[PDB]
Every structure is written in C-alpha cells, then in structure tokens.
Design a binder for this molecule. Structure first.
Ligand SMILES: COc1ccc(/C=N/OCC(=O)N2C[C@@H](C)O[C@@H](C)C2)cc1OC1CCCC1
Ligand SMILES: COc1ccc(/C=N/OCC(=O)N2C[C@@H](C)O[C@@H](C)C2)cc1OC1CCCC1
Ligand SMILES: [Mg+2]
Ligand SMILES: [Mg+2]
Ligand SMILES: [Mg+2]
Ligand SMILES: [Zn+2]
Ligand SMILES: [Zn+2]
Lengths: 328, 324
C-alpha cells in the first residue's frame, strides 16, 4: 500500500488484474488516492521498480504530485478516471494474444501515458477552449490542445523534488519512452479517433500470429500503433465494464458535460452537443455512443486479440441493452 | 528619401532588404509590411486602422531578437517581401481571396518571431522548456505562432479587430497551417506532395491555376511561404553572400554551446571544421533546387528567372571546390 489507509483495501486490490476492479471503492478506501495506490500496486506487480531502478519513495512522491494535479471538482476527468485508464491498460497489456510482445520499457510507457493522459483537465472540451480563445488554445494553436497540455504537465512534474522516476533510465531509454508516451497521449484526442480506428482495421486485416495465436509485431510502427489503440480503448472502456461501474461513469460524464453547457449558456454561446441539461437524453446518448464509437472500436480490438476480448464485447452488448431499456 | 527609392523595388525579387534595414533605423519588417499593406490596399479592405498596424508591427519587430544573426527581423522582412512577390506570379492571378493573401503575408511576418537562434533539435536535445511545452513537435514553429498571435492582444495591436468572426477563424487556421509548414522536418513530405500536385495541375484558358478546394489552396500557400523562407540562394550574389554569413554565424554559435555542454556538435555548426562552399552547394543540391524546380514547374514559366539565378549561384559556389 502506497498511501495511509485502514484498510481492507487489499481485498479490493486483489482484482487489480481484472476487468471490473471497483475503482470507486478503491478511491474511497484509499482516501481519494486511487491513482497513487493502483500505480504503486502495478509497478510492484510488474517489478518495474527493480527493472528501472526507481526508488519507491520517488515513485510515491511523483504519484502524489501527479494525483494532486487532477482537479477534485471535475466530475469525470479526475484522478479516478486516470486510475481507471491506468488499471484498464494494465489488464489489456496482459492479454494472452500479446504475451511477451512488448519490452518492459514499452509497458512502462503505456502505463505512464495512461497515468498522465488527462492531468490538469479543466472539465471542458478542446472545442470549448478554442471557442473561448483560451490561453491554452493560443499556446497550442488549436491543435490537440488538452492532450498537448496533459503531456507537458505530466513530464514537467518529473522535475519536482524527488519526483524523477526516470532518473535511472539511460539517455536512449528516456528518449524512446518519451517519444512513445507522447505518441500515445496525443492519440487520445477524440478528433483522431476515426483515423486511428481506420488504421487499426487495416492492421487487423493483415495481422500475423504464432501457432498459439500470439501477435507478431515487426517494428516500432506496429508496436506503437497497438499501444496507441490500447490506451485509446482503455480511455473508452466505460461501457464495457460491469454495469454498476458504467452507470456511475455515465452519471459523472453528464455532470461534467452539463457544467460546460452552463458555462456556454451563460456566455450566450451555442450549447455543445449533449451539454444541455434542459434538453438531454442521457440514455439515448449512451446507446448512440456505443453504436457509433465504442462498439466499432472494441469490435476491432476484439478482432486483433481474438478471442481474448469476447467477454468484454458481451458485456458491452448487455450494457447497450440496459440503456436501451431505460430510454423513457 | 533614399528609403523611398529603395522601396520602389518592393514588387521585385532582390529588393535591397539590408539597405532598407539600415535606412529605416532597423525597422525593415515594419517598413516593408506597411508598404505592402498599402500597396495591396489591405488597410481599406479589412478596415485596419493604420495606427494599430504600426503599433502591432513595431511590437512584432521588437520580438525578433537583436542578437541573433540570421533569424531576426531582417529575415522576417525578407520572407514577407518574397512571399509578396510570389503572390503576384501570373499563374496565380486572381486565384487567392484577399483574406488568403493577408494570411500568407501575416504568416510570413510572424513565422520566426522570438527565435532563440538554435534549432529544434538543439532545443529537444538540451531538454529546453520550449521542447517540454511542445512535446518535441515543431517546437519553434508552434512557438512563433503562439507569440505572433499573443501580440495581437497588446494595447491597440489587434489588426484583425474588424474581421468578421468567420474571417478571423479562417485567417487563424490558414496562418497556423502555413507557419507549421516552415518546419524543415516536414520539407520532404511537403515536396513529395507538391510534386504530385504539379503532376495533376489544372489551368484556366488564360493559363491561371485552378485550386478548387481549401486543401489545394492551402497547399500552394504553404509551399509558397516555404520557398520564400528558402529563397536566399535564389537572390543576387551580393544578397546571398550576406545571408550565408549570417546563418553560419548563428550555426557556429549553436555549435559553440554544444561543445561547451560537452555535446556532439551538429552538422555545419563546427566553426573549426566547416566549409561554406561545400555546405551551400549541398544545401542547394539537396534542398533548395529540388524545391524551387518544383515551384517553377507549378508556375512555369513565371519563376524561370529565379531558377536561373539559383542555378548560376550553384555553379558559382561549386567553382572553387576542386573536382575530378
Ligand atoms: C460514459 O460515457 C462516456 C465516457 C467517456 C466519454 C468521452 N468522450 O470523449 C468526447 C468528449 O470528451 N467530448 C465530445 C464533444 C462532442 O463534447 C465535448 C463536451 C467533449 C464520453 C461518454 O459519454 C458520451 C456519450 C454521451 C455523453 C458523452
Ligand atoms: C544562406 O544559407 C542558408 C539559409 C537558410 C538556411 C535554413 N535552413 O533551415 C534548417 C536549419 O536551420 N537547420 C539547423 C541545423 C541543425 O542544420 C540543418 C540540417 C537544419 C540554411 C542556409 O544554409 C545552410 C548551409 C549551410 C548553413 C545552412
Ligand atoms: Mg474479490
Ligand atoms: Mg483526454
Ligand atoms: Mg523558422
Ligand atoms: Zn481520458
Ligand atoms: Zn524562416
């Protein structure tokens, strides 16, 4: 355990290797430190401290700082979402079809990218930031504004006192991990979804597997592509989770969206799609989200790692039925 | 006075820009931008208060670094003026809207603002704050854009104040697209696509190019400003020599910092082991000529005088290099 608690957190953390970890429970039991606790657990499980000579106190110090820079008053894009994506990536990394495909450095990059990928999220969209002429959009030229910011912050925090968890990587290692983490977080920009999926389908069509069905990736292009899509899937994994988890994620994203719509309405701006609390169809919207975004993505991932992801797909379909059933 | 006579050549390749800098009190960017805006009737068209223009331009010019030998206000003024000339090439007559013309010229003016005199790779390799900010991706070019637009916020500096919301939005997208294309790491991809565009190009009866969508139009503007940025070797020898002096001074200062830091010194940045002639001939052969012969193809025969000068300058510099 990497944070002061008491306790029974251990019984819940037994599911850290399973889809459907109750991450909200973890948040409660850990004093709202789900990202620190789950990251610390994963790093120990994967022996990453020993491999990369990461001092444990340095890891905890960085995680505490990183966690503090997720906004507590943001309903969805907060430290629990970061913890969720981290843990979800951790599960996907261990899928049998990917056995021994990735290096420990690649595993570290995926997990680190997952942890920082929404840090300092303000609870409003890229388009909102652009439309309101935010300093952030001015900084990043309207291009992957948030995602560029999340990386800048995640890396800059390494420079805080006793926070450089990469201090004992080689120069080449840090350079490679940096490139991979950047490639991965920039791929979480939803504006890149259709292209990313399109390329993922292409890769699937011409995939190569050993006898036991293990994927053969040849080069960096292959490997980074699978990692990009993996963390993208993890980011978009809410509707594939056990329904009670999914239901809370839906509650939180709508709360966050509605708060942006309130900011838009207050400034006399056109209210963004699905951000109008006065005219929302939350259930119908989740069904469309699954039909046009989440299922097409996950159907393709499932193909890539066939048959590893079948139950994830089945759960997605069951959860689609639930929101369908509850349209008024 | 004398300045006025020099600015008469503003519509011509090979404007004595260094003379203009001396004569204006080191305000080439302000003088040349003002002149071009007046010539193209840009103040009237976009209702730009002339006082606002000068205030912006003076502040913009102030944010080019004095102590940087190549990437300064004179380079900026040169690229602006060169783009201004290319815009009027016969093959592009009446093709671009006034907004697109404004975007191309504004982009040129800001395209290197607050340049520190060291390369992207240097900034990446030294773990600079700029590289941390921009995730190692077009580090300087993103920065130029951010600063160029940020200055519009200064008091009485918003030259786009009377653009419609939509015009401002379009201008902003176009300028970003253009300045990002000045990143040399994108050169080969730009050039490969330009060659493919040339292959399938369409012209009117009078012979002007037909660019019927934003993609084709911005592509031409991107490559035009990139050519302007890479136009030094196409200029009269007296001007080209001066640009070569300055880029080498700048590079060698980077090399100096690399050596002090114990770093491996970048190509062409080692003052002790560098050859001007050899370096310019390679620069022409492998970057500038491939690009300009493609531009010349696009607008043939509009740019043949430019291409001729470049090929003469190449022949000139290779002539003192011993060869079999
Ligand atoms: C549990 O559900 C979700 C989980 C995660 C996400 C993340 N989505 O990424 C997009 C985004 O962030 N935008 C998109 C833009 C149109 O609107 C901008 C305010 C921001 C969305 C979820 O629900 C959808 C479906 C209906 C409500 C949203
Ligand atoms: C008058 O000459 C020039 C004018 C302009 C330029 C602009 N070059 O753009 C690229 C660049 O800045 N760098 C930085 C450094 C790492 O090296 C490059 C591979 C990439 C170059 C000129 O001459 C060459 C030949 C020798 C000096 C350079
Ligand atoms: Mg259990
Ligand atoms: Mg995000
Ligand atoms: Mg530049
Ligand atoms: Zn996310
Ligand atoms: Zn330049």
């Amino acid at each position: 355990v990497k944070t002061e608690q008491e306790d029974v957190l251990a019984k819940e953390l037994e599911d850290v290797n399973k889809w459907g970890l109750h991450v909200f429970r973890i948040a409660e039991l850990s004093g709202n430190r789900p990202l620190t606790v789950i990251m610390h657990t994963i790093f120990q499980e994967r022996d990453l401290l020993k491999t990369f000579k990461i001092p444990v106190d340095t890891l905890i110090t960085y995680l505490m700082t990183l966690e503090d820079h997720y906004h507590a008053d943001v309903a969805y894009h907060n430290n629990i979402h970061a913890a969720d994506v981290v843990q979800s990536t951790h599960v996907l990394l261990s899928t049998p079809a990917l056995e021994a495909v990735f290096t420990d450095l690649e595993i570290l990059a995926a997990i680190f990218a997952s942890a920082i990928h929404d840090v300092d999220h303000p609870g409003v969209s890229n388009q909102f930031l652009i439309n309101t002429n935010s300093e952030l959009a001015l900084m990043y030229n309207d291009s992957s504004v948030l995602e560029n910011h999340h990386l800048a912050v995640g890396f800059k925090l390494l420079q805080e006192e006793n926070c450089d968890i990469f201090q004992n990587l080689t120069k080449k290692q840090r350079q490679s991990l940096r490139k991979m983490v950047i490639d991965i977080v920039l791929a979480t920009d939803m504006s890149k979804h259709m292209n990313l999926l399109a390329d993922l389908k292409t890769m699937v069509e011409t995939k190569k597997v050993t006898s036991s069905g293990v994927l053969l990736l040849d080069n960096y292009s292959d490997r980074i592509q699978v990692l990009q899509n993996m963390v993208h899937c993890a980011d978009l994994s809410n509707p594939t989770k056990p329904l009670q988890l999914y239901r809370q994620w839906t509650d939180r994203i709508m709360e966050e969206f509605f708060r942006q719509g309130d900011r838009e309405r207050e400034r006399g701006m056109e209210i963004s799609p699905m951000c109008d609390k006065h005219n929302a169809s939350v259930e119908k919207s989740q069904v469309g989200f699954i039909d046009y975004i989440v299922h097409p993505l996950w159907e393709t991932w499932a193909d890539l790692v066939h048959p590893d992801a079948q139950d994830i797909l089945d759960t997605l379909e069951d959860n689609r039925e639930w929101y369908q059933s509850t349209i008024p």
